[PDB]
Amino acid sequence: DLDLAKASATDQLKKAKAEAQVIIEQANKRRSQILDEAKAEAEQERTKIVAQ
Amino acid sequence: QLNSTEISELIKQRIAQFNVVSEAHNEGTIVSVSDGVIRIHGLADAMQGEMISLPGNRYAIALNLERDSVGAVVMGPYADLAEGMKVKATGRILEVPVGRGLLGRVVNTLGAPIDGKGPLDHDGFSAVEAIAPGVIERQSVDQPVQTGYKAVDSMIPIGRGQRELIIGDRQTGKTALAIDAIINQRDSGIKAIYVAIGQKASTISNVVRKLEEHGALANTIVVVATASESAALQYLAPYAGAAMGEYFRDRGEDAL
Ligand SMILES: Nc1ncnc2c1ncn2[C@@H]1O[C@H](COP(=O)(O)OP(=O)(O)OP(=O)(O)O)[C@@H](O)[C@H]1O
Ligand SMILES: [Mg+2]
Numbered sequence: 001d002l003d004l005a006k007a008s009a010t011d012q013l014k015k016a017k018a019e020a021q022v023i024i025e026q027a028n029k030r031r032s033q034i035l036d037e038a039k040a041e042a043e044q045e046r047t048k049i050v051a052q
Numbered sequence: 053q054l055n056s057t058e059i060s061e062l063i064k065q066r067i068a069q070f071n072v073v074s075e076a077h078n079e080g081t082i083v084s085v086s087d088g089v090i091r092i093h094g095l096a097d098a099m100q101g102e103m104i105s106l107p108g109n110r111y112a113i114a115l116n117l118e119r120d121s122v123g124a125v126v127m128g129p130y131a132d133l134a135e136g137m138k139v140k141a142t143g144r145i146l147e148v149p150v151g152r153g154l155l156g157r158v159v160n161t162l163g164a165p166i167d168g169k170g171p172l173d174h175d176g177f178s179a180v181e182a183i184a185p186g187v188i189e190r191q192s193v194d195q196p197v198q199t200g201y202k203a204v205d206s207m208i209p210i211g212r213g214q215r216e217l218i219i220g221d222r223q224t225g226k227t228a229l230a231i232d233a234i235i236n237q238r239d240s241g242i243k244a245i246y247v248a249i250g251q252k253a254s255t256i257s258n259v260v261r262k263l264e265e266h267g268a269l270a271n272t273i274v275v276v277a278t279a280s281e282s283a284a285l286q287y288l289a290p291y292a293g294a295a296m297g298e299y300f301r302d303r304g305e306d307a308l
Binding site for chain 1: 229264265
């Protein structure tokens with residue numbers, strides 16, 4: 001159970017590093033969504049202002 | 053394109069419209085003046101609620117027909133008057149212009165335009181004092197009036213033809229809620245009217261500017277009586293505003 005415990009602890013440690021990365025990846029994607037919708041709303045607003 | 057020739061043609065057309073032959077009129081004299089109230093001697097042919105024309109372009113309303121005098125109120129600055137000035141009687145009962153050509157204009161309670169846009173186009177006149185349609189002529193309200201806000205469309209819904217009082221203390225958002233209601237009818241096919249009684253003038257200009265900023269102004273009539281103007285004008289402001297709204301009601305359209 002020393003051999004088992006060392007191997008299993010490493011598998012757990014691997015897992016946490018991986019899942020931290022996938023959270024950060026998804027966060028950058030959500031950032032990109034927010035910013036692209038920011039560009040979209042910027043343009044829409046300008047189209048209103050010129051008519052005024 | 054601004055064009056001089058079309059203006060010249062219009063002036064000539066006004067000369068053609070003028071009729072030189074005169075008409076007999078009943079006349080009277082101002083006897084006493086105070087605080088916008090007037091006492092007039094003469095006008096044997098006057099009727100209660102009539103519009104009396106004073107010197108200049110100002111008018112007055114006949115309130116009391118006493119035995120030997122008429123009690124009246126000036127619809128403007130009264131300080132320029134003096135006992136003895138002749139006043140003529142227009143048989144017209146108090147009236148104001150009406151029509152769909154008024155949309156997008158800022159107008160005094162006497163129907164005169166206050167904006168710099170120019171003279172006004174109207175589909176005749178409607179009377180300021182009138183009695184509303186009777187019990188048999190009414191119909192149940194069955195259609196929504198979608199204002200912008202979540203709360204009042206969900207909890208306190210308003211139907212076309214309903215009367216709903218926005219009540220609260222000063223600086224609580226009453227004005228904002230009302231004009232956001234106007235602005236959301238911009239596309240719903242409901243005509244809008246805004247009557248400002250006694251507000252500070254700067255407010256009214258800022259409100260019209262915000263209505264223009266969202267493109268709702270082309271769907272609104274705005275009636276103005278500033279805090280500076282004579283009390284009679286304020287008192288009659290909502291009645292004039294009501295007289296304009298009835299035009300759309302009676303032609304089968306919806307108005308707010
Ligand atoms: N939805 C809102 N969110 C935040 N502030 C708002 C909102 N609606 C209105 N206000 C604010 O309320 C304040 C007063 O608005 P408003 O002029 O409509 O009030 P009022 O009670 O009608 O005022 P008054 O009695 O002076 O006419 C303004 O500062 C405005 O920004
Ligand atoms: Mg207000």
